């Protein structure tokens, strides 16, 4: 489940609260995008490697 508004290159791909169905992954592969925005609050559930 997307904890925030999934978007890339400005346009929004998956709305907030909506699950990422396989068509979304396929379309994101087709668009060929890697860099996305994210609120800093989502970093709270992350652990540093080194």
């Amino acid at each position: 489940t997307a904890s925030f508004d999934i978007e890339a290159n400005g346009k929004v791909y998956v709305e907030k609260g909506r699950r990422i169905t396989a068509r979304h992954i396929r379309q994101l592969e087709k668009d060929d995008v890697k860099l996305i925005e994210v609120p800093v609050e989502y970093i709270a559930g992350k652990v540093v490697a080194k």
């Binding site: 489940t1 699950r19 169905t21 396989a22 068509r23």
Partner: protein
Amino acid sequence: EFDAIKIALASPDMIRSWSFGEVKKPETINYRTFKPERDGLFCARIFGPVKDYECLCGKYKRLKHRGVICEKCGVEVTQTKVRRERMGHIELASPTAHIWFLKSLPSRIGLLLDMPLRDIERVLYFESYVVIEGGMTNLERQQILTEEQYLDALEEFGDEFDAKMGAEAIQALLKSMDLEQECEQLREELNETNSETKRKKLTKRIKLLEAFVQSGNKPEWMILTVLPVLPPDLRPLVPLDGGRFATSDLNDLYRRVINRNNRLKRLLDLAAPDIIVRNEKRMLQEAVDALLDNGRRGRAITGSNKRPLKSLADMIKGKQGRFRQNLLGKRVDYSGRSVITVGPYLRLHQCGLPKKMALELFKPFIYGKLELRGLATTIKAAKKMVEREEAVVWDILDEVIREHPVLLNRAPTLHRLGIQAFEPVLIEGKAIQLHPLVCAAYNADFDGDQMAVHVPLTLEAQLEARALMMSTNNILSPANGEPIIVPSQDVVLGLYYMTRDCVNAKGEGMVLTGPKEAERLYRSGLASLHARVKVRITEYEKDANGELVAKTSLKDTTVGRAILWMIVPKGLPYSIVNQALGKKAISKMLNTCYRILGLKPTVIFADQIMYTGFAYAARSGASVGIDDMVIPEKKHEIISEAEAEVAEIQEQFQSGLVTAGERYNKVIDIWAAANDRVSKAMMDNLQTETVINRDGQEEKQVSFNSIYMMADSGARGSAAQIRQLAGMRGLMAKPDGSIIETPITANFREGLNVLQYFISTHGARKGLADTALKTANSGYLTRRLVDVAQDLVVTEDDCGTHEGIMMTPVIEGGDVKEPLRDRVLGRVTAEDVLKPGTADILVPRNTLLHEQWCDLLEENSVDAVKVRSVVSCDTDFGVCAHCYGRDLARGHIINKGEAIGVIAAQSIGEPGTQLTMRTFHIGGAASRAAAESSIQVKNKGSIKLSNVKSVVNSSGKLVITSRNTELKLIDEFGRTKESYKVPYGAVLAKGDGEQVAGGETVANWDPHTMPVITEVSGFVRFTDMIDGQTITRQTDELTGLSSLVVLDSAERTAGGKDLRPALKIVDAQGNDVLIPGTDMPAQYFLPGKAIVQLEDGVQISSGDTLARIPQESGGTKDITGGLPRVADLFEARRPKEPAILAEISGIVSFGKETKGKRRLVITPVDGSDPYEEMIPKWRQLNVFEGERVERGDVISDGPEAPHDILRLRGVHAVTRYIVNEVQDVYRLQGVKINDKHIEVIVRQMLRKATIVNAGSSDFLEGEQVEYSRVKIANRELEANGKVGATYSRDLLGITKASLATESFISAASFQETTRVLTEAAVAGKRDELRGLKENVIVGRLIPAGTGYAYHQDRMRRR
């Protein structure tokens, strides 16, 4: 001689009093001329002489020097028998800890000083110091100091302060303890502190301190200072073949202990460095530990072959200890053993001994009579004459063997009938001939089993074997009123083939004047044994007061039944043989013969049935061929239909309609249905397909196929074995209890494939590995059942009360499984029973209702009899005769002074073991029913739906929304006749009040996956269900529908365990809906494996399904897998989800909201209201905020726990629940057990009773004491002006209640010998030798049967 046994601690002064010398050297026999060493474990100076009346060095030789002690070696010349009576002792250089008071858990040292076990074991095994006499510093009296901390304490406080370490420190701690000051301080703390856990710990320590201060014991004796040694004769070093000796365990342990002690003493004499002597003290402590109780420490030492050797505790505790191996059972002289053969020419009071066994058995008797007649002169001459087996010895053997009964005994003696007494008949050979009429009771098949004989020596033993244990007087099993001498497997076949008719014969329509001419016809062959003639018989009747009145009639019978009537005793009605006599028919015939005539006619008639069954079975030639099992011509159509339906099930589960477990539950369903259809079709085709002409056209008769004869007569067989011989073998089960998904489709008459045989191997191994590896946990049940009921014996003629359980005939889902007659028979009623001729009594208040009374109760259609139960009796240390009933083995009231606890425990405990060594007889078949999912009522009448919460469905028909419902069908009279259990979420085509016609369907449902349903319709919002965290959601992309499965508490995320899935109902505006009756929202909780095929906010109708949960109803349901339930009930295990009850009556309402979970307060209208309860949110509440609830009503749903039901609904309700559940479990396998035994066990459950308030008694507040003591004290106080003490019955399991028995010897002999012996030594208990096992161990007349009068005389003499 003595009347008590006292157990307590041993003082060093007392051990030295036991001590006769001081052993200080580990020198056994010197590997030379076999003399004991000077100061070793074996020595004549310390313990006693080796040879009888002889000195060690050889200064005295005969009795004329008895008493003097020699000079050269200092030994006494006395008996050599005293080597097993005169103990030595060891003077240890350093003290050591006795482990039984250290590691009992509860550790006595641990809770005596309130310091944990770990600190004490670290101190006693030299890892840390401990503080004694803290004094003028900050160190407490029990502080633990490590090595560095102790060094710091000495460098800063090296004053008169002391801090010891090891066993000496613990001895100082215990010696410097004041019991009275600690006791009063703990009493003050108990009075002050309000917490419950510290209260329990404090009261436990107070109990221990009270046990110390009451007896003469003292805390410092629990640390060993002197170590007594076992006498040498009880640890013998037998001289083997050669120069080596036996590797006796105790000798090696004593050698090691003496080594450590002597080395420690030598080091202490030489002033060794402190670390070395500390290590050697550790070695001494661990050596003494290994000697006392080996294996309780971390590692158990071994001497050779790396095998844990036994200490002084392994031979007192366990299966190989003295209590179970050499005290409760011993090897016995005057015994024999041989393989048994039939010899059917015998009688019930006769057995067959080999001619050579009787000469070795009755050898002293032969010696005595040879000396009496003067044929011999001395004992050795008679011995030589017997060994030479002279002709005179054979003549005189027939004299001693005449009327001296012996004890025939089998190896597994499951029940009371395992030992029966027969007179011997001397025959040649080497085999023990056995009368086949008792082989069913013995369970002694003739396939190579060994029985054991025993010779009653004394006069009383012979008379007991003649009057009590004789097989003639043992024709009624103690389990039930059915006879135990049932003909079987040849006699049943012979009688059934004789007492049968077919329409043709050599002579058919002829007339005879009696049985004699029928015999003349059959012997001459002028009329077949299956004719249909009209003989003239003279049957007798005893309508008068014991006088037989004659009558003569002309009845239409066969030749065979006429012949059989010749042996029927004068007095039975002829309408007992005028049918096809199977096994149950002749069992009922023998039963009614016993009930009407008596014992001698019954035994004579049983022998005559034996003879006339064997003769006409030999003459019958009822063989078996390969042309007798006929294959039905429609079984393959049934397997084709079942294959089509399971192929439909394939598409059903692969699509997603049902899951893997549901598919497995439905496939077994359809295979079992097909198996049941094939069995019935084959049975019909094999029992009716025969053609015969009556001198005209063809007529149908009951078939004469041999297999049908031996499957209908019931001689040996059932539906299962023959069903597998022809048609469908069925589906078999794995050893774990699961059933194979594929049943093999073939029969043994046609053959098996190379793969179907591999599949049937699963069931074949299941049966055997189930017998041999799960009869252990069924013999354990009967062991710990005989243990818990050994001390219960009838002691009084009548307790004279009015209390008694309420007795009803049970109908639990089918027809009348057991009626009133089979249930109340042979039990004394508790009050004047009211017939439906009300305001008038039918049966008096204290009449033992026999068969005539049972018939009278059946005639007037009585459905509610108040009967006296053995659990409600009022006697002390036993039960009165009237609260039990009949002997169940004789046709009269039970005799006062009979051990019924043992016959109850054995009767309960050996259908399980017997039938669990029988599941391989049918092969390996699952034998699982078809799990019917519909209600086909048969009888005509109305419906009384009790405790039903039904709702309206979208179709309009009633749907049940309650779990404790039952649909009872009652006929037009109003008496109860039928009762079916409808399940949750079932639709009803009818209701209550309407007279339902006989032969319709009223209820339908789905067997697997019982559904949760709703009361009010509306839209459902998916609350607390996010995909992945708590629910697995799968969705098809094309259609877009969610069919999710929820997770358990197992596979769910750890963080998300606080998230609980549920479906909340909302309206079009999303507002809160309400349950009809209250204002609380419709929060329908979802359990695990709940599948939902809906969408959020969909429009539904009221009373529809919402989710499905699989049931996983899988199992063979045999007595092997299916009886842990009896163990759970008897040991009283708390169920996993106990249904909370209403502990007090009054109005019901909530108090605080969400004190973690839900809360509820019950308040009465008159009394105080301090009761609150904690309600986890798992279970919905069947009550609301505005009703009145009574004591015992279920707040929630689930299985009842056999503690709260007792504490709330009383003794009668819990005993009836236990009786009903155990009876259903046993009747599921066809066993017939009388309920009296179960009530005896339940009464043995209730012996402990915690005190509510002290009152005027001397008992403490929370102390748990015997209920008999409480009753006696209350009855004594009520005779005075005081007031009795209020109590409450507790319910501990059979193991728990047996381990806490007042006589410590029983508990010590049963289980946990260390934990019981330590408790008895600490408490200083005093056994009274009151029960049966105590007198068995001591070796007296048990106060059970014939010795009960002697025990009464011995008790009343003091």
